[PDB]
């Protein structure tokens, strides 16, 4: 249903909570009363409705197919090109992934999407990352790789990844320090 | 000077002495004997007894009227037959 403010704007009138409840309950009864098309059309005037984009598969000069995508985490940005076919090589900033990320946690982050879709060793990846710390860079590269792999994995696989969280951009970012308190929430030691 | 065991006697059924005792106590309360015993443990002065009896009668009648009114008006609790208006 449209919210009470929506209904108030529709009726250019000022209602109350109980008025909205009465209207909504009457509408619900109208639904339950086998509302036909002639009535469902009127009802839908008060209803309110509540997928990852598949990037094009481009081709190189040699005709090898690939998909390019991008993603940002904290302050890091990553552009990932994933090839339709590959032996699992993942070169980051022209560097091998294991060398560039000396932390097995970051390696696991890189592996997460391809492991999830069971496509490890089936794609060669080139990831250019910039900015932020090591974990932010790992997250950005993971997001970019997942998005690029979407184009190559089936739609059901894409939906599964999105449900898992691979394909959802992280909204968690550092919260700015506030004046008069040490941290974003750390209130200075309460004097007495 | 009366016969024994004829007054306030209940025969236990199948040995459920608990149930028989509960029935006997219910009988005593219904006839008010427990009221009399616990009230006669001490002496209520006639003025206090009169006040208490008047208060009890007033409360009984008030409760009867309130219950009758509630029963009479309960029928209107049915779901609204003109909802939306």
Sign, CA torsion A33/A38/A39/A40: positive
d(CA A150, CA A69): 9
Distance between CA atoms of residues A146 and A157, nearest Å: 11
Query: How many Å lie between the alpha carbon of B40 and the closest alpha carbon of chain A?
Result: 59
Q: Packing angle between helix A134-150 and helix A104-116, nearest 10 degrees?
A: 10
CA distance B68 to chain A (A): 32
Tokens 């739609």, located at residue:
A155
Contacts of A71 (CB under 8 A, 6+ apart): A77, A78, A80, A140, A141, A142, A143, A144, A146, A147, A169
Q: What is the spatial distance between Cα B8 and Cα A131, in angstroms, rounded to a whole number?
A: 97
Check if the beta carbon of residue A108 is closer than 8 Å to that of residue A175: no
3-state secondary structure of A148: helix
Structure's resolution in angstroms: 3.2
For the beta sheet containing A95-96, the strands, ordered from the edge strand earlier in sequence to the opposite edge, are: A58-59, A65-73, A76-83, A125-130, A90-92, A95-96
Give the three-class secondary structure for A45: coil
Q: How far apart are CA A112 and CA A109, in angstroms?
A: 5
Q: What distance in Å separates the CA atoms of residue A108 and residue A122, rounded to the nearest whole number?
A: 17
A26 close to B (CB below 8 A): yes
Contacts of A22 in chain B (CB under 8 A): 84
Q: What 3 state SS string does chain B have?
A: CCCCCCCCCCCCCCCCHHHHHHHHHHHHHHHCHHHHHHHHCCCCCHHHHHHHHHHHHHHHHHHHHHHHHHHHHHHHHCCCCCCCC
Tokens linked to A143: 């997001």
Rounded CA separation A46/B17 (Å): 69
Nearest to B52 by CA among B39, B63, B41, B64: B39
Pull the structure tokens for residue A116: 């999830």
Q: Closest-CA residue in chain A for B82?
A: A26
Nearest CA-CA partner of A26 in B70, B74, B85, B69: B85
């Amino acid at each position: 249903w449209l919210i009470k403010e929506e209904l108030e704007e529709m009726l250019v009138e000022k209602l109350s909570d109980l008025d909205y409840m009465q209207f909504i309950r009457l509408l619900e009864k109208l639904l339950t009363s086998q509302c036909g098309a002639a009535e469902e059309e009127f009802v839908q005037r008060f209803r309110r409705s509540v997928k990852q984009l598949i990037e094009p598969v481009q081709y190189d000069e040699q005709g090898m197919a690939f998909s390019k995508s991008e993603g940002k985490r904290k302050t890091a940005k990553a552009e990932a090109i994933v090839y339709k076919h590959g032996s699992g090589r993942i070169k980051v900033n022209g560097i091998d992934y294991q060398l560039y990320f000396p932390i097995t946690q970051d390696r696991e982050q890189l592996m997460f999407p391809f492991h999830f879709v069971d496509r490890l060793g089936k794609h060669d990846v080139t990831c250019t990352v910039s900015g932020g710390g090591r974990s932010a860079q790992a997250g950005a590269i993971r997001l970019a790789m997942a998005k690029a792999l979407c184009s190559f994995v089936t739609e059901d696989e894409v939906e599964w990844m999105r449900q898992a969280g691979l394909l959802t951009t992280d909204p968690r970012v550092r919260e700015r320090k506030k004046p008069g308190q040490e941290g974003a929430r750390r209130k200075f030691t309460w004097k007495k | 000077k009366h016969l024994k065991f004829i007054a306030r006697t209940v025969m236990v059924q199948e040995g459920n002495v608990e149930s028989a005792y509960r029935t006997l106590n219910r009988i005593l309360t219904m006839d008010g004997l427990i009221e009399d015993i616990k009230h006669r443990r001490y002496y209520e002065k006639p003025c206090r007894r009169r006040q208490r009896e008047s208060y009890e009668r007033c409360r009984r009648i008030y409760n009867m009227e309130m219950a009758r009114k509630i029963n009479f008006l309960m029928r209107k609790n049915r779901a609204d037959p003109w909802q939306g208006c």
